[model samples]
Target: KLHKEPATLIKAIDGDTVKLMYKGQPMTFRLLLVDTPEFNEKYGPEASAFEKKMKENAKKIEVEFDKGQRTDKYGRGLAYIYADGKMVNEALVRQGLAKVAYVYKGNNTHEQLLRKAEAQAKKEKLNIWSED
Candidate 1:
């Protein structure tokens, strides 16, 4: 479930991570359950552009977490980001900008929904799913 407390988006660092201001404290969130192409990966430019677009529309967001862990090995706060009345994690997958990656322990609440969204995008060959 999403954290009841909301966090204000400061920046979408990439397709999966973001900098946010929570309770007046700056935090970086690695969006759980999805992995988009890295800004420094093979599709670097395209990935970065997509990330930029996502951030432009994400003025504010709510953060949520799985019960198992709080942060990854990198110390970034791991959580789901809700923005524009939608889960940004899932939105990325639905738009084919991301693919379902790791899930915490056994608490993947949006797993099925996200996979379905990805399937739809794959079927339509949208965005990241499109061949260059």
Candidate 2:
């Protein structure tokens, strides 16, 4: 199991990004291995709404780091987020509202779950995988 650090959701910027408080510091997180096409693009708002809903209902939020995890170029925290007792990044993929992206070679953590969930999304024809 990955080392999960406790955090508090300050905001859900989009489906794949968020602002949270970790260790008494406000940190912006770019969720590892997930992407959402927002900004008036296709399937944007649905993902956004889904993200908001998850943030709203989650009683506790946790963050787990990749083996070589740290801030990105913009100094945003990079990690996997857990909410409602599941990985939010994987949840997005499982729901078919997100795509697996930005995976680095060493950061192979949870790659299987993301890939399988994306495949599940396609097989289920849900959200971004659906024929709209």
Candidate 3:
């Protein structure tokens, strides 16, 4: 459940997060139900690089707010994002660039979708799932 209003994409921060401009205000959003690697984690560079490419390719984007916990401990908004009508969060998992990392209570409407995407990626041994 998200507002139909679109948010402007400011920049990508790792795989599952991005900086956004909403209503003329700056906000940081941590995508729900998907997780990539940290820049310091194993395979982190590749994951981050992939995310960077996605961001670059998505010059125009929109953010969707879920009807759940709105923020994390760090105050980042928890949400789903779309670039050109494509769900960026689910795309990452479907592409095997991210895993179903977390599901917040009350904010897991996309849990099954993300989990299924992760499963397909794992079965196909894509990207992060590759036995490298």
Candidate 4:
């Protein structure tokens, strides 16, 4: 089973990362392989706003770290975040709020859903995939 654990949001830093209180220790978590554009990039603020909205509305928040490279160079936890019992990373893509990226080989727990959502979002021309 995955090492899924409950967490409380200290803050949602951006669309793809957050600072969470887990087991009484606070840490930054980079949502695995889910890359939201920089805040200055087009549609970035929209993505961030959507994430914060997700956080605020979620009744349950949790994270699951990967077996391979659970932490990054910055020592932030690399994880998949589930908010309200659903995968937030994939949800972001389905809304065109983020991209499927930085996927290293051998560490893809939810890649299929993420890729499929991105494709659907692209076809729908949602937010980040807009015609403008």
lDDT of each: 0.77, 0.87, 0.81, 0.87
* TM-scores for candidates 1 onward, in order: 0.84, 0.93, 0.88, 0.94
TM-score-based ranking: 4, 2, 3, 1
**Tens digits of per-residue lDDT for model 4 on 1-132?**
677799988788988989999889999999997889888888789878877987789888988987688888998999999887888898899999898998887568778879999999999999888856
Please report, as a residue range, the 10-residue window in candidate 3 with the lowest summed lDDT. 1-10
Residues 1-132, candidate 3: write the lDDT tens digits.
Answer: 366457887777887778888889989999888888888886677777766776778756777778878889999988888887778888889878888977876888888988999999999999889866
Better of 1 and 4 by lDDT: 4
Model 1: per-residue Cα lDDT at residue 40: 75
Clashing pairs in 4: none
lDDT of 3: 0.81
lDDT for model 2, please: 0.87
Q: After superposition, how far is residue 7 of candidate 3 from its true place, in Å?
A: 1.6
Per-residue lDDT, model 1, residue 67, is 69
- lDDT of each residue in 68-105, candidate 1, tens digit only: 67788998988777776688788788888787889655
Residue-level lDDT of model 2, residues 1-132, one tens digit each, is 679889999888887888999999999999888888884887788778777887799998999989885788999888999996798999889998899988887677888889999999999999888866
